Amino acid sequence: SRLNRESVIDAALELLNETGIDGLTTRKLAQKLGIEQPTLYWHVKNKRALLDALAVEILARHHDYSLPAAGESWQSFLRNNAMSFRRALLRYRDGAKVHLGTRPDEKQYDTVETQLRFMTENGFSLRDGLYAISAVSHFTLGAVLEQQEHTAALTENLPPLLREALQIMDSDDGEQAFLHGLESLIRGFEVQLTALLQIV
Amino acid sequence: SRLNRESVIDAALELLNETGIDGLTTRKLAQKLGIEQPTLYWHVKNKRALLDALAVEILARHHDYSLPAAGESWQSFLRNNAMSFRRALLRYRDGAKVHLGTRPDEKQYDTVETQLRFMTENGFSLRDGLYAISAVSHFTLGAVLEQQEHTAALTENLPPLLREALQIMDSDDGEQAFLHGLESLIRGFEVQLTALLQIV
Ligand SMILES: CN(C)[C@@H]1C(O)=C(C(N)=O)C(=O)[C@@]2(O)C(O)=C3C(=O)c4c(O)cccc4[C@@](C)(O)[C@H]3C[C@@H]12
Ligand SMILES: CN(C)[C@@H]1C(O)=C(C(N)=O)C(=O)[C@@]2(O)C(O)=C3C(=O)c4c(O)cccc4[C@@](C)(O)[C@H]3C[C@@H]12
Ligand SMILES: [Cl-]
Ligand SMILES: [Cl-]
Ligand SMILES: [Cl-]
Ligand SMILES: [Cl-]
Ligand SMILES: [Cl-]
Ligand SMILES: [Cl-]
Ligand SMILES: [Co+2]
Ligand SMILES: [Co+2]
Structure with missing residues (x-):
């Protein structure tokens, strides 16, 4: 063809x-x-x-x-961006594995440059903005990778809390744990940013 | 043999x-x-x-x-546990990929049961403790997966902040970004735990 x-x-x-x-x-x-x-x-x-x-x-x-909205907060952008990245990874079998270790392509330069400049315009140094961005990317990739490979894998003497945790884990697609973790991450960046030079 | x-x-x-x-x-x-x-x-x-x-x-x-120390805080346990899990994953080529989608083995039951009970003894519901534990696992796996696959992959028209971010990224093995992200995660769980029923 x-x-x-x-x-x-x-x-x-x-x-x-x-x-x-x-x-x-x-x-x-x-x-x-x-x-x-x-x-x-x-x-x-x-x-x-x-x-x-x-x-x-x-x-x-x-x-x-991929890009913040007019007047969007850095917190909201990161949340929206992560949910989007997650949806995109989950669209194809092993899509997260496919992404692993890649670097931005030339076709993505203007976009990712905007993402980095945006973080710095909200008070993050480049390094701290990058650390936030990377943590979100890595957490999302991890969560997706575990969800997808577990579905692949699928092919009584349990202690009680583990038995419960496994039901919880298997009670949805992974989105609840992902979104809870996402909020934790974002708020941890916020504490750090607002701390400035104060011991935190 | x-x-x-x-x-x-x-x-x-x-x-x-x-x-x-x-x-x-x-x-x-x-x-x-x-x-x-x-x-x-x-x-x-x-x-x-x-x-x-x-x-x-x-x-x-x-x-x-794998297990908290006598009187160790849940924050310190999670930090120590993540650093350890990270070291273990990085010991073998594609060790993180190998872990992906696995569930606790019977030989790990008593250990992981202790981890889950520990979180609940520090105030987390089982669900919230599990969400913290999973977020740490997923973030660590993500970060390791990206570091390892990038090393595998290795086989000017850049915009300025991206060029800088790439040097930063390539200036160490990944440990600095991982440890910064780890602190963000842990503190985000702490905010959530201490909030109880208060809007946060
Ligand atoms: C956080 N979110 C998921 C990001 C995103 O939305 C991207 C996109 N094209 O829209 C990425 O490229 C994004 O997903 C992504 O893959 C990113 C990266 O790989 C890197 C790497 O590898 C090295 C330096 C800088 C970046 C980065 C700033 O472009 C990263 C941005 C990531
Ligand atoms: C956070 N840290 C890296 C943990 C750890 O130290 C482990 C270990 N054996 O010592 C895990 O097994 C640990 O790394 C790990 O792999 C865990 C899990 O996979 C699960 C799964 O998949 C489903 C329910 C419960 C668990 C879990 C509580 O055992 C997880 C604990 C993870
Ligand atoms: Cl053709
Ligand atoms: Cl907003
Ligand atoms: Cl802010
Ligand atoms: Cl033999
Ligand atoms: Cl401690
Ligand atoms: Cl606490
Ligand atoms: Co990437
Ligand atoms: Co696991």
């Missing part, structure tokens, strides 16, 4: 979602696309190139709260 | 550390151990059994701050 960038990425997203990050082979991608391996190689050099491109596309498609 | 549980796990840990989670194949494990595949199969049924066992062993070996 068609082998422009957009279509090879569509195909790889479909393949990822069907087979997960282990089935995302250049050989199985070639089968999907109805082509021989040397034909695919012209367009896609290896699995790592595909993984990087998929990371970028996942957020392009489904990460919709 | 020897094929008791302890030795098959040693071997798989060595293999994981050499080849990462993709090289942890039952076929490459068999080569390592100097045996045929049907011989390995008697002892190890599949990659998933191996992954679960490795998750447990990684913490048995190198996760040394």
